[PDB]
Design a protein around this ligand. Structure first.
Ligand SMILES: *[C@H](O)[C@H](C[C@@H]1CCNC1=O)NC(=O)[C@H](CC1CC1)NC(=O)[C@@H](NC(=O)OCc1ccccc1)C(C)(C)C
Ligand SMILES: *[C@H](O)[C@H](C[C@@H]1CCNC1=O)NC(=O)[C@H](CC1CC1)NC(=O)[C@@H](NC(=O)OCc1ccccc1)C(C)(C)C
Lengths: 301, 301
């Protein structure tokens, strides 16, 4: 019992983190096989990164793997990431993949400074393609990831903080999530919405854990719910979302559209001082998979 | 910027987790040097664990270190933990200590099943010596820990779930936190309180992060605050607590007793639909150290 916002164990990723210093910029890099990936804004000196990178030399890049130097034997840029070719393959390279996630999906973040891990936490890709992380100067190059059995799917590399305190970054192929650029220009996040399928998943987690007070006799149609969703700045719920909530609906014996009726009432009436799973707000950064994973006990290695 | 409930990187602990099977009980163990620590209720068959342990043989204990067998060459019981002497020292043993924490202190939990890590999350030792964890059948033997630079301080080993869905366990010397026993007798948690110094720390985190709406002109004395604390089932605030909040008070320029006045108003008036750091409740599982750590970026290795 219990429900916590739970990150993946970070060991496999910790073994990949290195420090990349170039000029007076230090940030983190990800060392997989004989390549170190890091944000291209580590490059010296509106910037024109192809200009800037040709002025570079391999010896300009100081890569720190713990206390061991890594000799850079080549470099290239891939969209907004730099790939530093090094002469030693990381002996701790896990089985891995580069995946791009969808808004509403969750991942763990290993926050790092100077190539050293500070902490691990979970978050979601918001509908507006930002993440609500916890990142200070020097955190660039920290990565986000999911683990499936033994394989690390890297999905995020951190690049910048936007002026609402939210964060933006790229996939590991260097392509930004959202309409952001690695320029210290005026950029704004854009209007966010609540991830409806996740809120419903979390309501199922609450039921599995004994919070039942928000349940009701009522029911509703998918269209009548989506009419209320739009009013409260919730994302529309699709038949695919109803399908993915299926297993949770089966386990609890509450039909998806019934749990939607509960959410409608919660949206129109509030919680009246009650809490759900220790929260006084409707939580939307747990996916249906996160809930099943946590309430069935799937492990990794 | 940002504030997340952040766990320590779990790598150093992941390398210590093993599976201990004995009869039809499987749970987790902690493998440090040539000893495996696990809950003594793994023992066969109101139980009398000294009786039960003498009936035992070394070969009764199946210790799984990944896919490698560990031969048990001796066993002894230390309070409510078993120490299984094995013939191989764990080559991945970190620098470590066994520490007992105080109510109000926080730690990371590496939740494990069958010796394999499932996830990592942060929590606090409640004033009533329970923790609000996330634990399913098979999680016993999972540990809680803090990391200071390179040294892992183990503080918790998981043993049981109480009938409110909260969790109880021991330090690594086998001594329970709180008045609990490793007996499937009727046991109840006992009345909990809110950890006041932590709530104030979290309010300082909010100010550091730009939430300022709850701040006020007012002030108050330590005794007049503690009179309001007692009314709302908050722990009393001591001059020592005021002292530890000192650094946060300095950084923000808000005197501790002023932030107490803010908390009084929040207690008497509620939040009126506002949120603080993404919460509609007053959060009390961040210590002053957790806040400083996260808003200054301390790392580990
Ligand atoms: C890399 O270590 C840091 C991490 C960053 C610093 C504080 N929190 C963080 O996550 N990243 C950077 O320093 C960025 C480098 C730029 C991309 C090449 N810069 C920023 O994050 C930057 N934000 C920014 O310039 O974009 C928003 C903006 C700019 C101007 C006007 C309005 C909005 C800041 C200002 C945070 C350093
Ligand atoms: C070890 O893997 C499990 C972990 C436990 C199961 C579900 N969530 C958990 O954290 N621990 C046990 O199975 C415990 C072993 C007992 C200590 C020797 N048992 C329990 O946790 C047990 N709880 C319990 O017996 O105490 C509370 C109680 C008992 C009777 C009447 C009122 C209250 C349960 C019932 C959860 C298995």
């Amino acid at each position: 019992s219990g429900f916590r916002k739970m990150a993946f164990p970070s060991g496999k990723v910790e073994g990949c983190m290195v420090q990349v210093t170039c000029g007076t910029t230090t940030l983190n890099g990800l060392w997989l096989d004989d390549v170190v990936y890091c944000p291209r804004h580590v490059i010296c000196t509106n910037p024109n990164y192809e200009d800037l990178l040709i002025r570079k030399s391999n010896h300009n890049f100081l890569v720190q793997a713990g206390n061991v130097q890594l000799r850079v034997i080549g470099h290239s840029m891939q969209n907004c990431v730099l790939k530093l070719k090094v002469d030693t393959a990381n002996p701790k390279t896990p089985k891995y993949k580069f995946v791009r996630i969808q808004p509403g999906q969750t991942f763990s973040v290993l926050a790092c400074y100077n190539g050293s891990p500070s902490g691990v936490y979970q978050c979601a890709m918001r509908p507006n393609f930002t993440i609500k992380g916890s990142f200070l100067n020097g955190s660039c190059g920290s990565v986000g990831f999911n683990i499936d059995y033994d394989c690390v799917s890297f999905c995020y590399m951190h690049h910048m903080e936007l002026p609402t305190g939210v964060h933006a970054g790229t996939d590991l192929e260097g392509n930004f999530y959202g309409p952001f650029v690695d320029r210290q220009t005026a950029q704004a996040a854009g209007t966010d919405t609540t991830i409806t399928v996740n809120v419903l998943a979390w309501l199922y987690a609450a039921v599995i854990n004994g919070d039942r007070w928000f349940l009701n006799r009522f029911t509703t149609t998918l269209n009548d719910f989506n009419l209320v969703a739009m009013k409260y700045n919730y994302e529309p719920l699709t038949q695919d979302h109803v399908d993915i909530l299926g297993p949770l609906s089966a386990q609890t014996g509450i039909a998806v559209l019934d749990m939607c009726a509960s959410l409608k009432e919660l949206l129109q009436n509030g919680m009246n001082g009650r809490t759900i799973l220790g929260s006084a707000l409707l939580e939307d950064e747990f996916t249906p998979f996160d809930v099943v994973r946590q309430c069935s006990g799937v492990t990794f290695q």
